[PDB]
Design a protein around this nucleic acid. Structure first.
Lengths: 128, 66, 155, 124, 252
RNA sequence: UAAUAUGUCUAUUGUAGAUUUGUGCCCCACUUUGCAUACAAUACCGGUAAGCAA
RNA sequence: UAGAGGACAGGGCCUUGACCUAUUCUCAAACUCCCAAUAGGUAAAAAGGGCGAAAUAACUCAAUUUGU
RNA sequence: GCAGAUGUCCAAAGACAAGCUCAAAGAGAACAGAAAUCUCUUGUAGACUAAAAGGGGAAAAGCUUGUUUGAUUUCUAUUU
RNA sequence: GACUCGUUCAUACUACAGUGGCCACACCAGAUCCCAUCAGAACUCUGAAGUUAAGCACUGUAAGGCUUGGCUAGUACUGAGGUGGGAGACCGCUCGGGAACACCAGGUGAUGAGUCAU
């Protein structure tokens, strides 16, 4: 409720929706970057291994990109140490292009912003 | 010529430049003029413990130093 | 050109409908303690100890208590920072806060729940649930009970 | 069950509205009528009246026995001739409406209105 | 013109109950129940003296938000035990009730030994602070009797001597606390006439005592008390109003 | 006129607090010390009030 | 802006008004019975809280042992 | 910008307490009237509260009465 | 049964009929004083012969009225987006929030402790 309310105030400047398993796996594998550095000195680094994942989470037994996907899809007990550990994805512009960034995805006229629900997988894998 | 009489423009932006600071929240505040005849009694309370503690410590020091 | 003490308080300090008259009998019968959160609400029927222009409806800690007055610590925002201010008002203009009763029952809950949980050695969390997504459950909707509606045209 | 009309008060109306040299004579005739001292009207001094109770109430009533349209509706009657006349009566138990214990107000049917006033006037 | 119109009716107010039935004044009430806020739990236990049409009442009121609690209410009909069967509204009766509450609460505290009091008429005292009693007092009133009996038992109440015999008259104090101001009326009426004696001093002559015996019984009883203690519901209303309208269809 | 005050070469008192000591040479909790500093509390010095004043 | 009907005054059972009761048309930055949206404030536990003992005070309470 | 107001007034129009309830309307009453005075009924304030306006005020903050000088000295915590 | 200290500020109050004291109101009759009032009218006090007549305890009056529930109405209004419509005011659209003015019904609650009586 809290984050949905705080995101509704920013809805006209974003588009969001259901990620689904294949898309979360694609995002983590080919666009996943991780903060390996020390606290407040994070030094963004691509995953490329499981050593840093284990170093930050091995004592908390969620070591491995296997486990990170196993955990990000079904929001289990560790989302703090996954989302915050994961660097913000820097996506490419869409391959085929946006429809209208100025208008909502939900208006009858073509538009982009809003909740695409399950329709964001195509946009993500087009932007990836 | 006429001068800009007043405007609040840019003011809260200037405020948030360094942010809206907050009181430092000290644990103890002075009670210089706060309810006399009660904190005077508290002052009298403190000396009661102080005198016994001091005499006990001095006697222990003398008995241990011979 | 007019910045008096009561300027701009035509409706803020006006008495509500049916609420005219002095304060109730047992309004004088609240146990106020030091360091107590309290709301400061102006009562125009009582003129001495009237709260000042801006602090009506605010909330703050009690730092002073006198025979018929209360000193309240209220943070006020000016320009680029918030600073503490000590306002001394009479007790008819003071109403006990309803911020700490939200946790009074929680802290009584702790001493009865966490105690038994530890002594029996379970792990149970106590943080607020901030409930969002509803869980998954098996339901039974009746084929007779299910009814259909539809939209309407212009008229 | 003691429904009856009793006597509480009685006053006069000595109203002229002029300067001095006659308040003395007015108070003197009023004192000879009822032995007690009258008091004045407005003082913005233009009227006066006096009260007394006891058997003197019955005596002044007997003096004042001497139209059938303008009766009062609360047993508080008054008239005039020079002199005037005023008397305050009602049913008993009236004092709980004025006592420090339970200052209160009267109901309606227990008041005797003006029909009882006219009946009592013809009876007396 | 009508002042009882609906727009007027939609603006009325109400009074509050304790003054509305006349036990506290609601301004003196607030003044007595307010105490300094620096004194937390300062109960302000108020001594109350009141006069009925028949007896005298002395009570303790311990201030609470919900309401006050009396440890015990001093009664003037318990003086029948000590030696005052009738005459429970007298000056001596109020004095006896003051001594009653004082000494009985003193033995409740188990502090009679600590505060014996005084004999006849001339650590720290016991809690009491006076009530307004609504009424306007006068000199030599029986409100003094309870307070002075309580003082002679050991109690204390700050209270002005304006209403005191002499506006200082210890002779009138003696004449008061034993009630002999009825004895003076009795002697005067003896010399005046015997016509109203049957209707006035009936139970007194039934008891077969006198003016010099009023003081004796009162003093003996005061020493004794100093040393030892219908509805209709929704459907019913609907049925009845239907019956009423059906009846008035042809009634008048 | 002039800064604890001779009970003593222990050198005012608290809550935080850097460092040090150990017990379970490098992770942790308990005591051990309590820099600086902050918020206070106290005393004492000069002045002014108030009380007394040979 | 206008009414339904109706016990006070004026004129010739009649008339004219005034006035009255529940109703009618339209309005108020310096009018409110009611009253949003937005905006604003306080609270979200360890230098702390709960729970008992012991002490201390010249405070408070009738209390050298009620309370604070 | 708009409707205004201030450079005053008050030994009481300050303080306390008690008692009372006001404006108005209706019905009545020698002189006596639309009004001057008296009685009753209703009367949430439609009065009054020094002044401009806005708040507040009904065993009152209004009216009357009684007693008074707390409109006194000194110093704090503070709000606009 | 009653009252008491108090409470809750209208279930605790404004237009009509019905019940009333063994102990408790309240009415009583009076002024001699402590005494206080044009007036023993209030008040104080005196004692209890007559009284529930009153207020009121209560019941009830399709009354007032307390109030909420539904309906007004997703109407009015409004936060954010718009290279939306329109000559403008207005009017949609997407993400949200969301009133007020009439009617049917509930009846006029409850509080701890003590005394007297039974």
């Amino acid at each position: 409720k809290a984050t949905k309310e705080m995101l509704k105030i920013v809805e006209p400047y974003v588009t969001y929706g259901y990620p689904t398993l294949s898309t979360v796996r694609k995002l983590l594998y080919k666009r996943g970057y991780v903060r390996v550095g020390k606290v407040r000195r994070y030094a963004r680094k691509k995953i490329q291994d499981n050593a840093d994942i284990s170093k930050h989470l091995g004592k908390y037994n969620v070591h491995g990109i296997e486990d990170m996907v196993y955990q990000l899809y079904t929001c289990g007990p560790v989302f703090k140490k996954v989302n915050n550990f994961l660097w913000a994805f820097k996506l490419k512009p869409p391959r085929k292009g946006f429809k209208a960034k100025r208008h909502a995805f939900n208006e009858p006229r073509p538009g982009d912003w809003g909740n695409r629900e399950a329709h964001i997988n195509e946009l993500i894998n087009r932007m990836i | 010529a006429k001068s800009k009489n007043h405007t609040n423009h840019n003011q809260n932006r200037k405020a948030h430049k360094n942010g809206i600071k907050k009181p430092k929240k000290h644990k103890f505040m002075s009670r210089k003029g706060l309810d006399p005849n009660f904190f005077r009694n508290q002052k009298y309370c403190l000396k009661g413990i102080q005198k016994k503690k001091k005499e006990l410590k001095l006697k222990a020091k003398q008995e241990k130093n011979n | 050109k007019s910045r008096g003490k009561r300027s701009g308080t035509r409706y803020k300090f006006s008495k509500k409908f049916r609420k005219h008259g002095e304060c109730t009998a047992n309004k004088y019968l609240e146990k106020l303690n030091y360091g107590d959160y309290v709301d400061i609400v102006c009562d125009s029927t009582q003129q001495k100890g009237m709260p000042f222009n801006y602090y009506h409806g605010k909330t703050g800690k009690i730092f002073h208590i006198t025979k018929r007055g209360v000193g309240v610590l209220v943070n006020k925002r000016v320009k680029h920072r918030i600073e503490q201010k000590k306002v001394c008002v009479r007790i008819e203009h003071v109403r006990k806060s309803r911020c700490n009763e939200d946790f009074l029952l929680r802290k009584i809950k702790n001493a009865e729940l966490i105690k038994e949980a530890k002594l029996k050695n379970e792990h149970i969390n106590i943080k607020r649930k901030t409930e969002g997504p509803k869980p998954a459950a098996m339901i039974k909707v009746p084929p007779s009970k299910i009814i259909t509606i539809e939209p309407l045209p212009f008229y | 069950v003691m429904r009856e009309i009793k006597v509480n008060k009685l006053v006069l109306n000595i109203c002229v509205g002029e300067s001095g040299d006659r308040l003395t004579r007015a108070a003197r005739v009023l004192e000879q009528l009822t032995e007690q001292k009258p008091i004045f009207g407005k003082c913005r001094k233009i009227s006066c009246f006096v009260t007394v109770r006891g058997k003197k109430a019955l005596e002044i009533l007997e003096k004042g026995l001497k139209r059938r349209k303008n009766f009062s509706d609360t047993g508080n009657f008054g008239f005039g001739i020079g002199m005037d006349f005023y008397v305050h009566l009602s049913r008993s138990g009236y004092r709980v409406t004025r006592r420090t214990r339970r200052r209160s107000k009267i109901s309606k049917t227990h008041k005797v209105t003006k029909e009882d006033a006219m009946k009592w006037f013809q009876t007396k | 013109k009508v002042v009882k119109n609906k727009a007027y009716f939609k603006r009325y107010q109400v009074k509050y109950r304790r003054r509305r039935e006349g036990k506290t004044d609601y301004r003196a009430r607030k003044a007595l129940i307010l105490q300094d806020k620096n004194k937390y739990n300062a109960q302000k236990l108020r001594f109350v003296v009141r006069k009925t049409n028949s007896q005298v009442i002395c009570q303790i009121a311990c201030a609470h938000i919900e309401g006050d609690k009396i440890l015990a209410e001093a009664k003037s009909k318990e003086l029948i035990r000590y030696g005052i069967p009738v005459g429970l509204k007298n000056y001596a009766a109020a004095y006896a009730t003051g001594l009653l509450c004082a000494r009985r609460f003193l033995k409740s505290l188990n502090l009679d030994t600590q505060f014996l009091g005084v004999e006849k008429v001339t650590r720290k005292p016991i809690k009491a602070f006076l009530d307004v009693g609504i009424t306007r007092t006068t000199t030599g009133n029986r409100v003094f009797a309870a307070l002075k009996g309580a003082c002679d038992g050991g109690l204390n109440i700050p209270h002005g001597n304006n209403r005191f015999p002499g506006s200082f008259n210890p002779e009138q104090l003696r004449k008061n606390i034993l009630g002999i101001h009825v004895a003076e009326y009795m002697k005067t009426l003896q010399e005046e006439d015997n016509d109203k004696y049957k209707t006035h001093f009936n139970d007194y002559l039934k008891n077969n005592i006198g003016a010099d015996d009023i003081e004796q019984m009162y003093l003996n009883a005061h020493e004794k008390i100093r040393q030892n203690p219908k509805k209709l519901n929704a459907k019913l209303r609907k049925k009845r109003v239907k019956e009423k309208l059906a009846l008035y269809v042809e009634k008048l």
